[PDB]
Amino acid sequence: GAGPEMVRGQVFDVGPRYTNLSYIGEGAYGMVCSAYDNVNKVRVAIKKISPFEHQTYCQRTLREIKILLRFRHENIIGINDIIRAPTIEQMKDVYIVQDLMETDLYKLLKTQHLSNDHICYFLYQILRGLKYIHSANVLHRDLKPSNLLLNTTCDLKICDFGLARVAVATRWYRAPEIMLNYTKSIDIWSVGCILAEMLSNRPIFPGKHYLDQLNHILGILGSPSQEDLNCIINLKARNYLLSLPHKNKVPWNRLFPNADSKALDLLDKMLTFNPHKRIEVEQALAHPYLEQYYDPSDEPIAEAPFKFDMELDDLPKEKLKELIFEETARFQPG
Ligand SMILES: O=c1[nH][nH]c2cc(Nc3ncc(Nc4ccccc4)c(Nc4cc(C5CC5)n[nH]4)n3)ccc12
Secondary structure, three states: OOOOOEEOOEEOOOOOOEEEEEEEEEOOOEEEEEEEEOOOOEEEEEEEEOOOOOHHHHHHHHHHHHHHHHOOOOOEOOOOEEEOOOOOOOOOOEEEEEEOOOEEHHHHHHHOOOOHHHHHHHHHHHHHHHHHHHHOOEEOOOOOHHHEEEOOOOOEEEOOOOOOEEOOOOHHHOOHHHHHOOOOHHHHHHHHHHHHHHHHOOOOOOOOOHHHHHHHHHHHHOOOOHHHHOOOOOHHHHHHHHHOOOOOOOOHHHHOOOOOHHHHHHHHHHOOOOOOOOOOHHHHHOOHHHOOOOOHHHOOOOOOOOOOOOOOOOOOHHHHHHHHHHHOHHHOOO
């Protein structure tokens, strides 16, 4: 035997099936590598997750595993295999094996300029995948360029469903009502921020903190109306927004001077302050900007709305560890 595999001084115990590890990146309680699968004879992606110190991390890990194993769609990453220890006492990590994509939209927008036809095609695929997520009555809640995977041929897949919930995130893509007070409309806001980013290669609302975010949004949309603030919002935010002087609305064609007129019309409908007046996923897909790709006969929806049989928020982390251990059992030999 070669012993357990390692990446940057950390254990990455995926051998003997998965070898030739190459580091991709890491988060607060996870590390992602590429690996060679000696069974399917292809490179795969492997996310190491260590969530057992916290109840919220345990919830997140179980939600993503349950959602991605149920979900079946071309524009949503799947789970091909799961590695963990043979006993619950030894399980300190969970390894989720997924299809390897060439890059994410964060890295592509950092090095490449997108033509209008590539923006239109990437937007179409995001909303196609989102149409399936929302048809299952699930919210992604963390749509951003780093959670959108791309391959050589331009095929797109949505990943990272840890924050997903049935119907918190990166602040630049957060809907104003998350900061103010959530609903399916928060994902449409995020897609709106991604479209704006694809047009100019720069984040549309790059706030350094929660107040700077709201100031950035108001800087473009202008001061909110009485109806825009008439919702169940926190007193601090309301009083802060009412204390601000008037801000004029910046026309979309002034922010993106050479962007396609149809793309700015859709951008306007997605980046609407009031979530009730914001365009829904089906109407977005049927918008004139996405006409050359819209195909209702080839846009699948979930057979039924997704639901958790248990109250995951209420369960102690020891109970969630047992549910994670049992959920990953079908990937063990037997
Ligand atoms: O879990 C994730 N949430 N958001 C993420 C962004 C990543 N970014 C990423 N960049 C590049 C590649 N491709 C690559 C290929 C060869 C050499 C170096 C990198 C990549 N691929 C990838 C990730 C996944 C699954 C999400 C883990 N499949 N394919 N991901 C990787 C993982 C995640």
